[PDB]
C-alpha cells in the first residue's frame, strides 16, 4: 500500500495504529469479560 514512502517513525506509528477500529460501550464489556 503506502509501505516504503516514509521513514518518519511517527507517521509509521499512526498509520499502523489506525488499522484497529475503536470499541463501543458494549465492546469494552465483552473484552473485559474475556479477560
Amino acid at each position: 500500500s503506502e509501505i516504503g514512502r516514509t521513514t518518519d517513525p511517527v507517521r509509521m506509528y499512526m498509520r499502523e495504529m489506525g488499522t484497529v477500529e475503536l470499541l463501543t460501550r458494549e465492546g469494552e464489556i465483552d473484552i473485559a469479560k474475556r479477560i
Binding site: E2, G4, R5, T6, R11, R15
Partner: protein, 1339 residues
C-alpha cells in the same frame, strides 16, 4: 537665515536652486512604529489590526466567545535613561479590554447568558524612543528595515540552463505573505507541472482537478475549438480565418469558388484578409486533416450508449467513422496551432494518472503527507487548508495588489486567499509567456521588492504571539468551568510577550546600534537589508541580487554598501526616498507640464518611473522653467538616452537625489571612483568624536541636516531668549508669541554629559548658545558629539602636503606631525564600564571588601573602606577597582608547602582574591560608580553614600525645575497684572504668593490669572509627586539576576591620543595608518615657516582614482586662505567697513551660485561675530554633483592671495633646502577611525586553555592565542620547517604534558621540546571509537 546660521555662514557653491528640502531623515523608523502602536479606528495598522485578525475567539462548540473591545498602552515604569542604567527594556504595558460572552444553552440565537468585561494585561511592547531606537536590555538597538520580495505572482525563467539544449524553461510562482508557495513550471517536453512548497512536482492539471473542473471544463478553459460540422458530406469545417495565420496548408482552399492557396504553399496575412473579404466561414478539407486532432468534448453513443470518444482523445478516421454513425454531425475539436497556441494543457492531461477530483486530492495528499494512507475526508481538508482558508493562507493587501497587477486586473483589492480564478489566470499567463506573448518579471526590480519595516515586523511577531495565546484560549473555552471564570484567567501574557521579546532582542534585524558619531546612528536607521528572517542569506545570495539595478536610481544608494561578504545586501536609503503605503520605494520628481518644469513634486514608484521619460538634475534650465537646451539627457525605461524637450515628463528633484545621506557628505563625490566613494562613505561612519569638534572647511551642505535630524543635538522646541545657560542645562525664556495661555513659558534643556556610547566613546553635549542670546524654533542650543555649531563635524582640518617623505608614507601610511599631538587634535575620550558581580556561591557568598589577602596596602590605597574605588581616582592597568574575595575550600597543600608553612607560620587564607582590576594597558579616571544591591542584602557604606547622593540630586533637580518654572510663572503674572491696574510701585514689595489670589478688575484678564494660578498650584502639586516617585525609585532594591548579590559598575574615562598604528582616513576612501609622529622641525615647511601637519603619499591618488581628495585639498587651501586673511584683519584691528567689504567679496565669489549673502543687512555686531567665526578658515559648501568647479576654486585661491595651481614650494625641515618641485599643500579633513592600535595589540605567552580540546582560548578578551590556521601550516610545510611546525602543533598548543615541560625548560635555559601527542588527536580517537569504529595505534 537664522540666528544660528548667520553666526557662521557656509559659502555655498551649488548652482542648482533647490525645490525640495531634505526630509526628516528618520521618517522610516518613526512612521513605521507610529503605525504600529497608534490607535487606528479603521483597523488596518498595528495592534488594532492584529487584534481584529485574531479576535473574536469562538469556542469549539460556539457556546461562548472572547471578543475584544479596545487596547491601551500603559505608561513606562522607567524612562529611557533609567532603562539604560538598570539594564531593562524600555517598554509600555499593553492592557487590552476583553469581554467573555456566555451564551445560553437552549436559545434560538444563543442569547447572552452573561457578559464579563475586564481589562487583561498581555505583554509589554517595547517603545521607540524619540530618535528611532529601542532600549532593549539597556542597550540601544535599531531594528533595520528589510527588503524582501513582495508577495504576488512572479513569472521567471531559467535561460536554457537545463538539459543542454538551451531551452528557456518558464515558471510562475505564487508567493503569499503567509502560507504555502505554489509554483507552476514547464519541463523540457513542454508539460506544465506544479509544486507546492517546493516539494516534488505533479502534473499541473491535478491542481485543476482538485478544484472541481472536469477534463471537459479544463479543455474549455485553456482552449478554443475548431468546430467540424458534418453537413451533406465531405467533412465541412467551420473557419475562423485568423486561426490560419502563418502556416503551410497540406491542401488547397476552395470555398464556393476561387482557390486561395494551393497545396503546400505558405499562408500570409494577405490570404487571411482575402478569406475574410470573401467572408469564408466554411471549408471542406481532406479527411486526413483529422489525423492528430484532439477532440474537445465527451462524445458518446445514443444507440449503444458506448462512450465513443471522451475529451482529450486524439482522433483518427476510424474513430471519425464510428463517431459519425451515432448521429454526431457536430465534432468539436481543439485548436492548437503550433508556436502560438501550444498543446501544453492537453499534453499534460495525458501525463497525469488522475481521472477525477477525489483521485487528484488523493495524489496531492500523497505528495504532501507521504507514507500515510489518504482518506477522503482528510485529503479534501488538506487542500482547502492549503490555499483557501484565511487561517493558513494570507496573500495580504500587497499580495493581492501585485497579484491583480500582474494579471492585468483593474481591481487592486480583494480576498487574501486564492481562488479558482486566480490559479487559472496564473496558468493562463504562464502559457501566454510560453507562447511568446508575455515577458518574465525581473526579480530584482524595485517594483518587485518591498520595504518591510519596524512597525510591520513587530506587528507580525505580535500576531504570532496572539495566535499562540488564542489556541490556548480556544482550548480553555471549551471546558465546563465556563460560568465562574473571568477573561484574565484564560489569557497567558507570557507567549505574547515572549514573541515580541525574542523579536526585539534576538532577531537578525534587531541590531546593536552604531553610535560612533551622529552619522553612524542616522545611517544605521536608514538602512535597508536583504537579509533577515524571510529574506536572503549572505552565502546563498547570488551575483544578481547584489548588483545595482536601474530602479535603484534615487531609491537606494549605489555606493554606500558594505564591502565584505554582504555587499549589495545591506543597502542605504537615498536622501529623498520614501515608501509607498504598500512598502515599495518611491522618489520625488518635478512635473514638466509643457516644457516648463513645474515645482510640483510627485512621488514615483519604480514601475511608474519606467513609463515616463525623466530629465536629469544636471539638465540646465532658465528662470522661466524651460530647458535651455532642446536635446535633453533623460531616462525612459531604465535605458538612458537623449530626448526632445517636449518628450520630457518629469525631472529629478535634486542633484543629490541618487546618493544616500552618508555619501551626500563627500565633497567632490563626482570626481571619486565609485570604489573609493564607497570606502569614504563607509569610513565616515567609523570616525570617533574628538575632543573639540572642528567643522569641515569643505563640506557639502548636508552637515546641518545630519546633525539636527539625528538627536545628538539639543534643538530649541520654541524660540526665545536664553535665560540661563550652563555646562549642563539651558533655560530658554520663550517668546510670548509661542507660549500657550496658563503656562510658565520656559523650556529647560538638560544636556547629556559624558555618557557611554555603544562603542565606548563618549556622547557629551556642550551648550552652543551664550547667555541672553535670542534663539528661534529650530536652532541648535547644544552641540552633541561630533557637531560644531549644529554642523556635523567628524574629523579635523589638517594641513596636508602630498609628497613622498623618506619612506614614512609608503603604501598608504600617514606621517603626522607632532603638533597634531600637542594640540590634542585627534585625542578622543573613551568610556568603559567594568562590572564586578558579587554572587552567591555554594561555599558561601562572595563579598566586596577592602581586606584583600596577599595584596599590600599600596594597591588598596585608592579603595575606600567599602572596598570600591574612589570616584575621580587616576587608575592604571593592574589597579584594584572593586575589592572582592571568594570563599574557597579544598585547600590540600603539597608536602613541601606544608613544610614551608610549618617553618614560617604564615597560614593560608580561606578567601581567594577575586577583585575587579583595570585591564592591562588601560589608564584612566574613574568617573562614575554604580552599585546595585539585591533586595535583602544589606548595603555597605558606599551604596548608602551613593543613594544619599542620588536622593540629594533628585531633590535638587526637581526643586530647581520648580524654581525656574515658578520664576517664569511669576514673571508672566507680573506681566499680566501690569496690563491693567498697574502696580509698578506696589507689585515688587507684596509677597509674590498673594499675586496668585489678587482679584483684579475682571474684563477678561482675571480668567488668565485663574489659569496662571491653576498652573502654579498644579506645579506645586506635581513637583511633590515627581519627587516621591524618584525617592521610591532610588531606594528600591534592584531586580538582579538570580544568584548575584550585588553589582558594582565602575566607569573609566580614557583619553586616547593619536599614535603610530591608529588608522586615519579622509572622506574619499583614502584610509591610512599613522607610521610616525614626526617632530615639528622635521616637517616640510613653506616660505613663511608654517610646517605641514600631515604628509600623504601622492602615489595613492592616481591608481585609485579618487581625484576628489586633491580638489578638496585645493579648495581647503582656498578656504583657509580666506580665513587667514580675515584673521589678519582682526589682528590689525581694521574697521568693520573693511572686514564687511572683504567678507562680502568672498561670499559673492563664484559663477552663478544659488545663495546671496548680502551682509549690508548685518549689524556691526553680527559682522564681527561672523568674522570671528571665519577667522579659522571660511567654510565652503560643495554640494554633491553640483559642486564648485575647478575655475571657482582657482578664483577663490586668487582671492586669498595663494597660488592658483594649489602647489606651493616647500622646504625640507631637516636640511632646510627646497624640494625640487612644487608640492600640493592644502587642508584636508582627516577622520580618526575607530580602529585604534590600543585595541588591536595583543600578546600571550601562556594562558587559559580550552576545555574539551586543550588548546589556547580564542580572543584577546580571554587572553587569546592566535590561530595557526591550515594555511600557515602549509606555509611551514613549504619551507622545510618541520621543527617549528611540530612545536606549533604539540607544545605551543595541545600537548598537555609537553607545554609545561617546555615552559620549565625555557625557564631553565634549555630550549628543547619533549613533544607528545596533541590532545585533540586523542579527542578525535575517542570520538571515532564512540561511533562503533575501532581506530587504533599500531605499535
Amino acid at each position: 537665515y537664522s540666528y544660528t546660521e548667520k553666526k557662521r555662514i557656509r559659502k555655498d557653491f551649488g548652482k542648482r536652486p533647490q525645490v525640495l528640502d531634505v526630509p526628516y531623515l528618520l521618517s522610516i523608523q518613526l512612521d513605521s512604529f507610529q503605525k504600529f502602536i497608534e490607535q487606528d479606528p479603521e483597523g488596518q495598522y498595528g495592534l488594532e489590526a492584529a487584534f481584529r485578525s485574531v479576535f473574536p475567539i469562538q469556542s469549539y462548540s460556539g457556546n461562548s466567545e472572547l471578543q475584544y473591545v479596545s487596547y491601551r498602552l500603559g505608561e513606562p515604569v522607567f524612562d529611557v535613561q533609567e532603562c539604560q542604567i538598570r539594564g531593562v527594556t524600555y517598554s509600555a504595558p499593553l492592557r487590552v479590554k476583553l469581554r467573555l460572552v456566555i451564551y445560553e444553552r437552549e436559545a434560538p440565537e444563543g442569547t447572552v447568558k452573561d457578559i464579563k468585561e475586564q481589562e487583561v494585561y498581555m505583554g509589554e511592547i517595547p517603545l521607540m524612543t524619540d530618535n528611532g531606537t529601542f532600549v532593549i536590555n539597556g542597550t540601544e538597538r535599531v531594528i533595520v528595515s528589510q527588503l524582501h520580495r513582495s508577495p504576488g505572482v512572479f513569472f521567471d525563467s531559467d535561460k536554457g540552463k537545463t538539459h543542454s539544449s538551451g531551452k528557456v524553461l518558464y515558471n510562475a510562482r505564487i508567493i503569499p505573505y503567509r502560507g504555502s508557495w505554489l509554483d507552476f513550471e514547464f519541463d523540457p517536453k513542454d508539460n506544465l507541472f506544479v509544486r507546492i512548497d517546493r516539494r516534488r512536482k505533479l502534473p499541473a492539471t491535478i491542481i485543476l482537478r482538485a478544484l472541481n473542473y472536469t477534463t471537459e471544463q479544463i479543455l474549455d478553459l485553456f482552449f478554443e475549438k475548431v468546430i467540424f460540422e458534418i453537413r451533406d458530406n465531405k467533412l465541412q469545417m467551420e473557419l475562423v480565418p485568423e486561426r490560419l495565420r502563418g502556416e503551410t496548408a497540406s491542401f488547397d482552399i476552395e470555398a464556393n469558388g476561387k482557390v486561395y492557396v494551393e497545396k503546400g504553399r505558405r499562408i500570409t496575412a494577405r490570404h487571411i484578409r482575402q478569406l475574410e473579404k470573401d467572408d469564408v466561414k466554411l471549408i471542406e478539407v481532406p479527411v486526413e486533416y483529422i489525423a492528430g486532432k484532439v477532440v474537445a468534448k465527451d462524445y458518446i453513443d445514443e444507440s449503444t450508449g458506448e462512450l465513443i470518444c471522451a475529451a482529450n482523445m486524439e482522433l483518427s478516421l476510424d474513430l471519425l467513422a464510428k463517431l459519425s454513425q451515432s448521429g454526431h454531425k457536430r465534432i468539436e475539436t481543439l485548436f492548437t496551432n503550433d508556436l502560438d497556441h501550444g498543446p501544453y494543457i492537453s499534453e499534460t492531461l495525458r501525463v497525469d494518472p488522475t481521472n477525477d477530483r477525489l483521485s487528484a486530492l488523493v495524489e496531492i495528499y500523497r505528495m504532501m503527507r507521504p507514507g500515510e494512507p489518504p482518506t477522503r475526508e482528510a485529503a479534501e481538508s488538506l487542500f482547502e487548508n492549503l490555499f483557501f482558508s484565511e487561517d493558513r493562507y494570507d496573500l495580504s493587501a500587497v499580495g493581492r495588489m501585485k497579484f491583480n497587477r500582474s494579471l492585468l486586473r483593474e481591481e487592486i483589492e480583494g480576498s487574501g486567499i486564492l481562488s479558482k480564478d486566480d490559479i487559472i489566470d496564473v496558468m493562463k499567463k504562464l502559457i501566454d509567456i510560453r507562447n511568446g506573448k508575455g515577458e518574465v518579471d525581473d526579480i530584482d526590480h524595485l517594483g518587485n521588492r518591498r520595504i518591510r519595516s519596524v512597525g510591520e515586523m513587530a506587528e507580525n511577531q505580535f500576531r504570532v504571539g496572539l495566535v499562540r495565546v488564542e489556541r490556548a484560549v480556544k482550548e480553555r473555552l471549551s471546558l465546563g468551568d465556563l460560568d465562574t471564570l473571568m477573561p484574565q484567567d484564560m489569557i497567558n501574557a507570557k507567549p505574547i510577550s515572549a514573541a515580541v521579546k525574542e523579536f526585539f532582542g534576538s532577531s537578525q534585524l534587531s541590531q546593536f546600534m552604531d553610535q560612533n558619531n551622529p552619522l553612524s546612528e542616522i545611517t544605521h536607521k536608514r538602512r535597508i537589508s536583504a537579509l533577515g528572517p524571510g529574506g536572503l542569506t549572505r552565502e546563498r545570495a547570488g551575483f544578481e541580487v547584489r548588483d545595482v539595478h536601474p530602479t535603484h536610481y534615487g531609491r537606494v544608494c549605489p555606493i554606500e554598501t558594505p564591502e565584505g561578504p554582504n555587499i549589495g545586501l545591506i543597502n542605504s536609503l537615498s536622501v529623498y526616498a520614501q515608501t509607498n503605503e504598500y512598502g515599495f520605494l518611491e522618489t520625488p520628481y518635478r512635473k514638466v507640464t509643457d516644457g516648463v518644469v513645474t515645482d510640483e513634486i510627485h512621488y514615483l514608484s519604480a514601475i511608474e518611473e519606467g513609463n515616463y521619460v525623466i530629465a536629469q538634475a544636471n539638465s540646465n534650465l532658465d528662470e522661466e522653467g524651460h530647458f535651455v537646451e532642446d536635446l535633453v539627457t533623460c531616462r525612459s525605461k531604465g535605458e538612458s538616452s537623449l530626448f526632445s524637450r517636449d518628450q520630457v515628463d518629469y525631472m529629478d528633484v535634486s542633484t543629490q537625489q541618487v546618493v544616500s545621506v552618508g555619501a551626500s557628505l563627500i565633497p567632490f563625490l563626482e570626481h571619486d571612483d565609485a570604489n573609493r566613494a564607497l570606502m569614504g562613505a563607509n569610513m565616515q561612519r567609523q570616525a570617533v568624536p574628538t575632543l573639540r569638534a572642528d567643522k569641515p572647511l569643505v563640506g557639502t551642505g548636508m552637515e546641518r541636516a545630519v546633525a539636527v535630524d539625528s538627536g545628538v543635538t539639543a534643538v530649541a522646541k520654541r524660540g526665545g531668549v536664553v535665560q540661563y545657560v550652563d555646562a549642563s542645562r539651558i533655560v530658554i525664556k520663550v517668546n510670548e508669541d509661542e507660549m500657550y495661555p496658563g503656562e510658565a513659558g520656559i523650556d529647560i534643556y538638560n544636556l547629556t554629559k559624558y555618557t557611554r556610547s555603544n562603542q565606548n566613546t563618549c556622547i557629551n553635549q556642550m551648550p552652543c548658545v551664550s547667555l541672553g542670546e535670542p534663539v528661534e524654533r529650530g536652532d541648535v542650543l547644544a552641540d552633541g558629539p561630533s557637531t560644531d555649531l549644529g554642523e556635523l563635524a567628524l574629523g579635523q582640518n589638517m594641513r596636508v602636503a602630498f609628497m613622498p617623505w623618506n619612506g614614512y608614507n609608503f603604501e598608504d601610511s600617514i606621517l603626522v606631525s607632532e603638533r597634531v599631538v600637542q594640540e590634542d587634535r585627534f585625542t578622543t575620550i573613551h568610556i568603559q564600564e567594568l562590572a564586578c558581580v558579587s554572587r552567591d556561591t555554594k561555599l558561601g557568598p562572595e563579598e566586596i571588601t577592602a581586606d584583600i589577602p596577599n595584596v599590600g596596602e599600596a594597591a588598596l590605597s585608592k579603595l575606600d573602606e567599602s572596598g570600591i574605588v574612589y570616584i575621580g581616582a587616576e587608575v592604571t592597568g593592574g589597579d584594584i577597582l572593586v575589592g572582592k574575595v571568594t570563599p574557597k575550600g579544598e585547600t590540600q597543600l603539597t608536602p613541601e608547602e606544608k613544610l614551608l608553612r610549618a617553618i614560617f607560620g604564615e597560614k593560608a587564607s580561606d578567601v581567594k582574591d577575586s577583585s575587579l582590576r583595570v585591564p592591562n594597558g588601560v589608564s584612566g579616571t574613574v568617573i562614575d560608580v554604580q552599585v546595585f544591591t539585591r533586595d535583602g542584602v544589606e548595603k555597605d557604606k558606599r551604596a548608602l553614600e551613593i543613594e544619599e547622593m542620588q536622593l540629594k540630586q533628585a531633590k535638587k533637580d526637581l526643586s530647581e525645575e520648580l524654581q525656574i518654572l515658578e520664576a517664569g510663572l511669576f514673571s508672566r503674572i507680573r506681566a499680566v497684572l501690569v496690563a491693567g491696574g498697574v502696580e509698578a510701585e506696589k507689585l515688587d514689595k507684596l509677597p509674590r504668593d498673594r499675586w496668585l489670589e489678587l482679584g483684579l478688575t475682571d474684563e477678561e484678564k482675571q480668567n488668565q490669572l485663574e489659569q496662571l494660578a491653576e498652573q502654579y498650584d498644579e506645579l506645586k502639586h506635581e513637583f511633590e509627586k515627581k519627587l516621591e516617585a524618584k525617592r521610591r525609585k532610588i531606594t528600591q532594591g534592584d531586580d538582579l539576576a538570580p544568584g548575584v548579590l550585588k553589582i558594582v559598575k565602575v566607569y573609566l574615562a580614557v583619553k586616547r591620543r593619536i599614535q603610530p598604528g591608529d588608522k586615519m582616513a579622509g572622506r574619499h576612501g583614502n584610509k591610512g595608518v599613522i607610521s610616525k609622529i614626526n617632530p615639528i622641525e622635521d616637517m616640510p615647511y613653506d616660505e613663511n615657516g608654517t610646517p605641514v601637519d600631515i604628509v600623504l603619499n601622492p602615489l595613492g591618488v592616481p591608481s585609485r582614482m579618487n581625484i576628489g581628495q586633491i580638489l578638496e585639498t585645493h579648495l581647503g587651501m582656498a578656504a583657509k586662505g580666506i580665513g587667514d586673511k580675515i584673521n589678519a584683519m582682526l589682528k590689525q584691528q581694521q574697521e568693520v567697513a573693511k572686514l564687511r567689504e572683504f567678507i562680502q567679496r568672498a561670499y559673492d565669489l563664484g559663477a552663478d551660485v544659488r545663495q546671496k549673502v548680502d551682509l549690508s543687512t548685518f549689524s556691526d555686531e553680527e559682522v564681527m561675530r561672523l568674522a570671528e567665526n571665519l577667522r579659522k578658515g571660511m567654510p565652503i559648501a560643495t554640494p554633491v554633483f553640483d559642486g564648485a568647479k575647478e575655475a571657482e576654486i582657482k578664483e577663490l585661491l586668487k582671492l586669498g592671495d595663494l597660488p592658483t595651481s594649489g602647489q606651493i614650494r616647500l622646504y625640507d625641515g631637516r636640511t632646510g633646502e627646497q624640494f625640487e618641485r612644487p608640492v600640493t599643500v592644502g587642508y584636508m579633513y582627516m577622520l580618526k577611525l575607530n580602529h585604534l592600535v590600543d585595541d588591536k595589540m595583543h600578546a600571550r605567552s601562556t594562558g587559559s586553555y580550552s576545555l574539551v580540546t586543550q588548546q589556547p582560548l580564542g580572543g584577546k578578551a580571554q587572553f587569546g592565542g592566535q590561530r595557526f590556521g591550515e594555511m600557515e601550516v602549509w606555509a611551514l610545510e613549504a619551507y622545510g620547517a618541520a621543527y617549528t611546525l611540530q612545536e606549533m602543533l604539540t607544545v605551543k598548543s595541545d600537548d598537555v604534558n609537553g607545554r609545561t615541560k617546555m615552559y620549565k625548560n625555557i625557564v631553565d635555559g634549555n630550549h628543547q621540546m619533549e613533544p607528545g601527542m596533541p590532545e585533540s588527536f586523542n579527542v578525535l580517537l575517542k570520538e571515532i571509537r564512540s561511533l562503533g569504529i575501532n581506530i587504533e595505534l599500531e605499535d
